[PDB]
Symmetry: C3
Subunit: 116 residues, 3 copies
């Protein structure tokens, strides 16, 4: 087996697929400025990438959720997250505080999923 790549540039591929596994690059928000909208936009991008990479939201295996300010933003994160997930099909997850590459980014999520 060979890895296949999705949306490759000279730093990263949005997705790498290998042996029924899908490895997504950490996804960042669009132009939203607030935690609620940024979380929605991050999840929208993951939704799209899963489709391109041959998976779907129901097949997420793990998610690391990085919050620039975990004390300030965890509740809002959980609100959008819990509403976006398919019912009863939540993945394994870890949420931790970390500054992201751009100061405006409040949230970034890194997903591994099962090809479907």
């Amino acid at each position: 087996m060979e890895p296949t790549r999705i949306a490759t540039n000279d730093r990263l591929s949005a997705a790498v697929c290998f042996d029924a596994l899908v490895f997504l690059s950490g996804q960042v928000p669009g132009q939203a400025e607030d935690i609620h909208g940024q979380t929605r936009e991050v999840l929208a991008k993951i939704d799209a990438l899963l489709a391109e990479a041959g998976s779907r939201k129901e097949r997420i295996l793990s998610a690391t959720i990085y919050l620039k300010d975990i004390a300030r933003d965890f509740a809002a994160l959980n609100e959008v997250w819990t509403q976006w997930l398919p019912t009863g099909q939540a993945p394994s997850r870890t949420t931790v505080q970390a500054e992201l590459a751009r100061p405006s980014v409040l949230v970034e999520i890194t997903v591994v999923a099962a090809r479907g």
Copy 2:
């Protein structure tokens, strides 16, 4: 193949199993307040989840260890960790500083393991 889930709520599943792989949610301490006891309790929970998910401590593949204060607590973390691991069967690991969802949490560990 379909992913199977263990102890699912509307945010996360404690474990997700797919194709001989086990993805655990980041595990946090019980009611211990000190680094030594918190690390022991985190490892106890991982021990339990591996059992439920069809793996065991000898079959851990990777561990990300998050410490709220890596300078202050790394030595104690290593002490409990090295004693808990089955001899000669340490997994791949990465230990980094990150604040966790609750301020009382000094340590959180995210494990991927092989089904056995």
Copy 3:
């Protein structure tokens, strides 16, 4: 299937291999003191470990890149990273800020790869 281990000590194995997957411990620099040289040395070590673990740079699936100061050092990190990667074969990646176990460490990278 059984996991096999590479360069095991009582805290971690440099690599764990299981079912065509390679899990590397987070790699830290040698004695370089600057971000550019530290990033080069981290990538050199990963290069070596991939060889020992039966993979290669072209087969990296995911990389988490930890920077002690993401604002200060991301540009230099990207410079060395983009030059080291095999052309058109970048993996999935996530770059976040986190303090590492030693204060001198500016960068640490955790890789999962496909056995080849």
